[PDB]
Amino acid sequence: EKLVQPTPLLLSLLKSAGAQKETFTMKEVLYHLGQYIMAKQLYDEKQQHIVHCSNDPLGELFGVQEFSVKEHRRIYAMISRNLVS
Numbered sequence: 001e002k003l004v005q006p007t008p009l010l011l012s013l014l015k016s017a018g019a020q021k022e023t024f025t026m027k028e029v030l031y032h033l034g035q036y037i038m039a040k041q042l043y044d045e046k047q048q049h050i051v052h053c054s055n056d057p058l059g060e061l062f063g064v065q066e067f068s069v070k071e072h073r074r075i076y077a078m079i080s081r082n083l084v085s
């Protein structure tokens with residue numbers, strides 16, 4: 001599997017959620033981002049698949065401040081913009 005390298009901001013969020021390295025598989029990056037979202041309680045109370053970013057630094061990585069965990073292609077796109085090329 002390919003080990004990717006999150007840029008500064010993204011990496012900071014992953015480490016806050018428990019990540020302890022600099023390179024990860026995309027599966028690991030996503031797992032840690034999910035943990036970050038749960039830790040920060042960014043998910044919507046009523047529609048739990050919805051993630052609110054307008055009040056969190058995670059919002060800096062998205063154009064539209066709300067995304068669904070069901071939007072895998074969109075989420076992969078966001079991460080790609082935050083990987084060392």
Ligand SMILES: CCOc1cc(C(C)(C)C)ccc1C1=N[C@@](C)(c2ccc(Cl)cc2)[C@@](C)(c2ccc(Cl)cc2)N1C(=O)N1CCN(CCCS(C)(=O)=O)CC1
Pocket residue numbers: 030031033034035037038043048049050069070071072073075076
């Ligand atoms: C952060 C929220 O993530 C998810 C939330 C949901 C619910 C709550 C809407 C169903 C479903 C799937 C999830 C959920 N889907 C995952 C697998 C995923 C994997 C790849 C991609 Cl591209 C997108 C999503 C992941 C890892 C996630 C990863 C990145 C991001 Cl930005 C958000 C979530 N995620 C996750 O973190 N959890 C933790 C909480 N778990 C809670 C499981 C509870 S239960 C009763 O359904 O078993 C479920 C898995």
